[PDB]
Design a protein around this ligand. Structure first.
Ligand code: HEM
Ligand code: HEM
Ligand SMILES: Cc1cc(N)nc2cc(-c3ccc(CCN)cc3O)c(F)cc12
Ligand SMILES: Cc1cc(N)nc2cc(-c3ccc(CCN)cc3O)c(F)cc12
Ligand SMILES: C[C@H](O)[C@H](O)[C@H]1CNc2nc(N)[nH]c(=O)c2N1
Ligand SMILES: C[C@H](O)[C@H](O)[C@H]1CNc2nc(N)[nH]c(=O)c2N1
Ligand SMILES: [Zn+2]
Lengths: 412, 412
């Protein structure tokens, strides 16, 4: 009832009781562990009050007024509004708390040491896709902050019935387009090929090149979504050069500064915000390992091996690893020389260990998904590899949701 | 009741029903996942017959005679012997099947494609520590096979009462000694420091150097354990050189050829074999990443960085990664140039994916522990990073057991 997580590189032990607050289910059972399944898995007014009460009880317990006068009245206020409207509305302060804690509880996030420094943009007065575009542009500009990146989230109106849904159809505000070829291969980002042709469907005019920034596809209040192109002055990009290999520029590689995921659902006291794009800054490996070196992504280990004078015949020459380290020294160096915020997987994972100690101290635990926290290269030389982690689903939370084109009752 | 695991680098999907046979518990619940906990957690004659029956039912179902004449008689034979002796004895063939399947079910093992080619040495007639030494020496010689390594396991008598236990006190048959220093630091292998002084306790005379092979500490039939030194001609060692950097020899590094874990418990039809050393061959990373570059192990990233002309001031120069790749090219190259069997983490993980497909095909699944299967470097450029895995505990199995010095009722 009070479980222990050990670190095996430092012999450090912490005791988890925060998992007792856990409510949702993990997909694991007593006889099966699903901690490597990628995505394991309309509401009524009955269900809504325990979720609202539970949330309000932790919000007022966090401003040091649990069960006090303001809390019992807010309880009644929301109870009455859920009887009346079969839903309710969060205070600005409750929205900001809920957002920061959804991040704080995101067990797959290695960057959560920053969770309390999150800028919450309340876009709950938005009514149209143009309104959404405007809010998103201000989000991008604000979070980019000329390379001194700042964490932010923009929260569009919550789901009501279910057919009046606000959705960003992009999986990230800033993504490079993916184009299939005659010979089957892929220019640009193979991840986004289907989306890059959904945009062409709704009317995008593709500049069929490499690092072409995709347009926004914004659905407001359930209406069919509409295309908007982010002003290119708002999309900050870092050209990737190496601090030794001058042929690295000839590779002609660049990535965007702002990782801003836009396809997930924010849940706060039973309220479902289906459009809530949030951004931080990149950890180096997400670009230099996964974006660049994934087989089904940019898949550039070919060239980086070549130009380095590498033994590509033998699988065991570790030419794949050797080009992988250089690519990540190059993204880091390129980003830092342009004063664009980036964190290397060593500093980010040490920060997470530090963050984990803070959580267990003042909170009683820190839900963490080892499978996602360990970086996708050099795993065991980072401190998180050796750190046992308990994963469990606290709320408020970010949750996956299906892509909107699989679910949307179209009409136009 | 019929779960699906997906690969996300190939979009390949397999269906797991083998988990329905699963019996033991995983440590996870519906509300907590412990898949990153390192070690989560005397028998009676009542418990023994279902375990014996279950095992016999799968053994006879494997030689294509399930429920037939020989099976129902063997059932009765073991039933009668568990009534009589409150235990029982495995046939040579049942022992070999049980052993191979404990390996086959070891969800943390990436090398299981070889599980059916396991050499089972039956040492159940052993009575003394000298007998154990003899069996172990023949094991080492056989499995080493002059560098053309062969998988093997030696199975000492099963636990009976609990105070007459056969145990190898070494965690591996071949381990380098670890000596603390005046200035606190460590010569040799810091992992084994406590064992390296337990040997000195029982009378070892330490050649306090680096790669000093430890003596065996063999406990037979519950008696106090005794020291034996493996003939050095039986301990095959690979000097580590790099195929580019001639200062790599000056590092003066070597590892033993034979990974042969000796501290675990083999469980077969409810029978507990507390001493069952088993060996295969090293995957490169266990030496070049964990053994060499772990903080609390040989911790040699210092020098390999230095001699390479590396920027060690900045954490973000990825000097740690850069020395790590070279070290692993060097272990691989050194082992292969000496015709000593070694497998690189690329081939071993591709083989495991191939093996996984075989299992789901002819068996209905393959218990796999993602946390342990993904190699500790370059995780996402190997195919297992992108492979969802269901972990569950089948039997026969290898299980952890406490170190014998924490449990042994001494007397001498
Ligand atoms: C401030 C800098 C940040 C860094 C360095 C960071 C780092 C990461 C990384 C490396 C991942 C793994 C995702 C992948 O590998 O594809 C991740 C996931 C995640 N991040 Fe953070 N992040 C940051 C900010 C944020 C913010 C501001 C939020 C929310 C407001 C957030 C919420 C999440 C969530 C919910 C996930 C997991 C979602 C899933 O299940 O896929 N992060 N983060
Ligand atoms: C044939 C070559 C083999 C290779 C390349 C191999 C590879 C590995 C690796 C890399 C690990 C992870 C352990 C660690 O990282 O410290 C492992 C674990 C394991 N291996 Fe294999 N292995 C081989 C043979 C065998 C054999 C012959 C057996 C049993 C008879 C076996 C049973 C196990 C078990 C039970 C574990 C996990 C034990 C635990 O929970 O710590 N392996 N193996
Ligand atoms: C705020 C943030 C910052 C960052 N630096 N990186 C992030 C990565 C993801 C993310 C991206 C893709 C996938 C699916 C494929 N891996 C899961 C994710 O969590 C995310 F949501 C948010 C991120
Ligand atoms: C047969 C075999 C082959 C190999 N090539 N490697 C192996 C590694 C381990 C092993 C070693 C240490 C630990 C604890 C610290 N990691 C767990 C293990 O499973 C093991 F048992 C067996 C192995
Ligand atoms: C199969 C596995 O669940 C999947 O590849 C996961 C593993 N861990 C990950 N970890 C991070 N940070 N990002 C990912 O995309 C993944 N992918
Ligand atoms: C904390 C974590 O459970 C621990 O470090 C595990 C992670 N995965 C591992 N995987 C392998 N192959 N070997 C290990 O020692 C470990 N250690
Ligand atoms: Zn689990």
């Amino acid at each position: 009832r009070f479980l222990k997580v050990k670190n095996w590189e430092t012999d450090v032990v912490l005791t988890d009781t925060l998992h007792l607050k856990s409510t949702l289910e993990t997909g694991c059972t007593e006889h099966i562990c699903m901690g490597s399944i990628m995505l394991p898995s309309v509401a009524t007014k009955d269900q809504l009050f325990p979720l609202a009460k539970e949330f309000l009880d932790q919000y007022y317990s966090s401003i040091k007024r649990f069960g006090s006068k303001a809390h019992m009245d807010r309880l009644e206020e929301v109870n009455k509004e859920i009887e009346s409207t079969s839903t309710y509305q969060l205070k600005d302060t409750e929205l900001i708390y809920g957002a920061k804690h959804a991040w704080r509880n995101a067990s797959r996030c290695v960057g959560r040491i920053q969770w309390s420094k999150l800028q919450v943009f309340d876009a709950r007065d938005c009514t149209t896709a143009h309104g959404m575009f405007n809010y998103i542009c201000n989000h991008v500009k604000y979070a980019t902050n000329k390379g001194n990146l700042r964490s932010a989230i923009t929260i569009f109106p919550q789901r009501t019935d279910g057919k009046h849904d606000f959705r960003v159809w992009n999986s990230q505000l800033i993504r490079y387009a993916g184009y299939k070829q005659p010979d089957g291969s892929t220019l640009g980002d193979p991840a986004n090929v289907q989306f890059t042709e959904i945009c062409i469907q709704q009317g995008w005019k593709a500049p069929r090149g490499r690092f072409d920034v995709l347009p926004l596809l914004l659905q407001a209040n359930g209406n069919d979504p509409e295309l908007f192109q982010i002003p290119p002055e708002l999309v900050l990009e870092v050209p990737i050069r190496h601090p030794k290999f001058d042929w690295f520029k000839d590779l002609g590689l660049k990535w965007y500064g702002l990782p801003a995921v836009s396809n997930m659902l924010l849940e706060i006291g039973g309220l479902e915000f289906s459009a809530c794009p949030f951004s931080g800054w990149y950890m180096g490996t997400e670009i230099g390992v996964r974006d660049y070196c994934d087989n089904s992504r940019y898949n550039i280990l070919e060239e980086v091996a070549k130009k380095m004078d590498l033994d590509m015949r033998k699988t065991s020459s570790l030419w794949k690893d050797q080009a992988l380290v250089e690519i990540n020294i190059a993204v880091l160096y390129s980003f830092q020389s342009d004063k664009v915020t980036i964190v290397d997987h060593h500093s980010a994972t040490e920060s997470f260990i530090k963050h984990m100690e803070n959580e267990y101290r003042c909170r009683g635990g820190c839900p963490a998904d080892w499978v996602w926290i360990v970086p996708p290269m050099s795993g065991s030389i980072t401190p998180v590899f050796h750190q046992e982690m308990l994963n469990y689903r606290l709320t408020p939370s970010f949750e996956y949701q299906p892509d909107p084109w699989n679910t949307h009752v179209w009409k136009g």
